[PDB]
Amino acid sequence: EIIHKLAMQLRHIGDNIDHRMVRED
Amino acid sequence: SQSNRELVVDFLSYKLSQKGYSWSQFSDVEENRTEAPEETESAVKQALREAGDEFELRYRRAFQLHITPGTAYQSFEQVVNELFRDGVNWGRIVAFFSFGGALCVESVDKEMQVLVSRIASWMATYLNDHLEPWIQENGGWDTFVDLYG
């Protein structure tokens, strides 16, 4: 379970610092 | 065209240096450290270094793997696969760099420093094979600099 847990924590913080790109639609 | 090798080497060099280690101790691949600050590649490198610092700070505020030389490749690839399975964005790419940097630092601490050059290889291969189409379709590393630099 540790691989999934770690990947989802990395992904959560990744999405938190992201959502910066402007959607043109 | 932007070298993904160059970004991996720069980022891992930075993370190792923050813990007192030198990339050149673990690989004979060199980074271009003389390019002008005004160059786009220097701007990409700086944006990625700072984004990694900010990612690691935010990760530490909110949040076992037991890396071994026999399991490191599968553990790296499986985490990265799950990270990107439902999509790519620049923040997840920063997470990918910070994850690799963390594995490298830990590998030197635990007397497994042969892994430093191998993690770097796996990162560059993943970038060149699996992230590069998205990078190219989303405005390239220049867009990353606009958003994070």
Q: Do B78 and A10 touch (CB under 8 A)?
A: no
Q: In chain A, which residue's Cα lies nearest the Cα of B64?
A: A2
Residue positions counted in chain B: 149
Judged by CB atoms closer than 8 Å, whether chains meet at B55 and A13 is answered as yes
**C-beta of residue B26 within 8 angstroms of C-beta of residue B113:** yes
Elucidation technique: X-ray
Reported as half-sphere exposure (CB side, CA atoms, 13 A), residue B24 has a value of 4
* A-chain residue closest to B80, CA distance: A7
- What is the span of the domain harbouring residue B25? 1-149
B79 touches chain A (CB under 8 A): yes
Could you give the number of structural domains in chain B?
1
Q: Tell me how far apart the alpha carbons of residues B37 and B69 are, in angstroms, rounded to a whole number.
A: 37
- Are B143 and A21 an interchain contact pair (Cβ–Cβ within 8 Å)? yes
Q: Which of B83, B38, B103, B19 is nearest to A7 (CA)?
A: B83
Token pair recorded at residue B144: 């990353």
Q: How many CA atoms lie within 13 A of B15 on its CB side?
A: 28
Q: Name the residue facing A17 among B55, B80, B81 (closest C-beta).
A: B55
d(CA A21, CA B87): 14
